[PDB]
Amino acid sequence: QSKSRKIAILGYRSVGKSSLTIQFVEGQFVDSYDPTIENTFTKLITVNGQEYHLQLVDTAAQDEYSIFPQTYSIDINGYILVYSVTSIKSFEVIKVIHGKLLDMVGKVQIPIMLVGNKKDLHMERVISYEEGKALAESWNAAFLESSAKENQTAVDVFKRIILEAEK
Numbered sequence: 735q736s737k738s739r740k741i742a743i744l745g746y747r748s749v750g751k752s753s754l755t756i757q758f759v760e761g762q763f764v765d766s767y768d769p770t771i772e773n774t775f776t777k778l779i780t781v782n783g784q785e786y787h788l789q790l791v792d793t794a795a796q797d798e799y800s801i802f803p804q805t806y807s808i809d810i811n812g813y814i815l816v817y818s819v820t821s822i823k824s825f826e827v828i829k830v831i832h833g834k835l836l837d838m839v840g841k842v843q844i845p846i847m848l849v850g851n852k853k854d855l856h857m858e859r860v861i862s863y864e865e866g867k868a869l870a871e872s873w874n875a876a877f878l879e880s881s882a883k884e885n886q887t888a889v890d891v892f893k894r895i896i897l898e899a900e901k
């Protein structure tokens with residue numbers, strides 16, 4: 735009765751894939767990392783009374799040239815696509831990533847959500863809320879903005895991808 739989830743987090747370099755994950759897992763914010771290394775965390779959380787066993791695959795940076803597999807993994811229960819509100823490139827890239835992710839997964843019922851991270855960097859935003867939101871809507875995906883400095887926003891990200899898979 736203790737549910738299980740493997741979640742993959744995707745996106746361009748330095749968008750905050752690791753920071754969000756670490757903030758959600760260890761409750762702290764970090765200034766540096768090992769960019770091209772894949773990392774996997776385990777985290778237990780109770781969402782609405784139900785206990786979930788979480789595996790979080792913090793993938794290495796990908797761009798428009800990264801190879802996406804042609805076939806999905808059964809054991810992966812959902813995908814978080816991250817970009818930074820401070821980087822146009824990361825936004826262009828997350829669209830390419832969604833594209834290649836959709837080729838890989840086909841019609842299979844595995845949730846994909848979109849996260850615009852670094853919302854706390856007000857003076858460096860180059861992507862509006864409406865643009866991320868409308869992109870997500872065009873994908874029939876969920877959308878949140880987040881800051882890896884703000885624990886509750888990282889919580890809301892993972893909670894939402896879990897809830898999508900229950901839908």
Ligand SMILES: Nc1nc2c(ncn2[C@@H]2O[C@H](COP(=O)(O)OP(=O)(O)OP(=O)(O)O)[C@@H](O)[C@H]2O)c(=O)[nH]1
Pocket residue numbers: 745746747748749750751752753754764765766767768769770793794795796851852853854855880881882883
């Ligand atoms: N202010 C602010 N800085 C952030 C936020 N998220 C990440 N950063 C910073 O952005 C830089 C990149 O963060 P990472 O978590 O390493 O990004 P990443 O997606 O894991 O990048 P790769 O591992 O290279 O793929 C780091 O210096 C972080 O401290 C955020 O939400 N707000």
Ligand SMILES: [Mg+2]
Pocket residue numbers: 751752769792793794795
């Ligand atoms: Mg990473």
